[PDB]
């Protein structure tokens, strides 16, 4: 990504802020917000039943 | 004495490591003036950077 210092400027050990951000696209995550309630249902229903999966 | 009678190999190598040894500390110390050197005159200009300030 992108510097979070330009040269010169002074940093310390473990400091706050990454200096430059390194990412690895191949793969991606995707995280899915699910309604806490709904899921339920989902093992609720997968074994409600029925329901099913792959 | 090398060569010559009283050397002992044994103890001219003895003192010879007192050499290896002891200048191993003069490297050691150089350094303790260099890191305090570079923690003196460390102080301050600047951001190796040159520019408008």
């Known amino acids: ?54 | 004495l090398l060569g010559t009678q009283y050397i002992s190999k044994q103890e001219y190598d003895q003192a010879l490591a007192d050499a290896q040894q002891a200048n191993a500390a003069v490297t050691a110390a150089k350094a303790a003036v260099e890191t305090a050197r570079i923690n003196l005159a460390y102080t301050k200009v600047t951001s190796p950077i040159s520019g408008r300030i």
Request: proline share 2%.
């Open chain 1, 1 to 54: 990504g992108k510097s979070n210092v330009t040269e010169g400027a002074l940093v310390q050990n473990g400091q706050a802020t990454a200096l430059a951000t390194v990412q690895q696209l191949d793969p991606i995550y995707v995280d899915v917000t699910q309604s806490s309630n709904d899921m339920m249902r989902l093992k609720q229903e997968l074994a409600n039943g029925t329901l099913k999966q792959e």
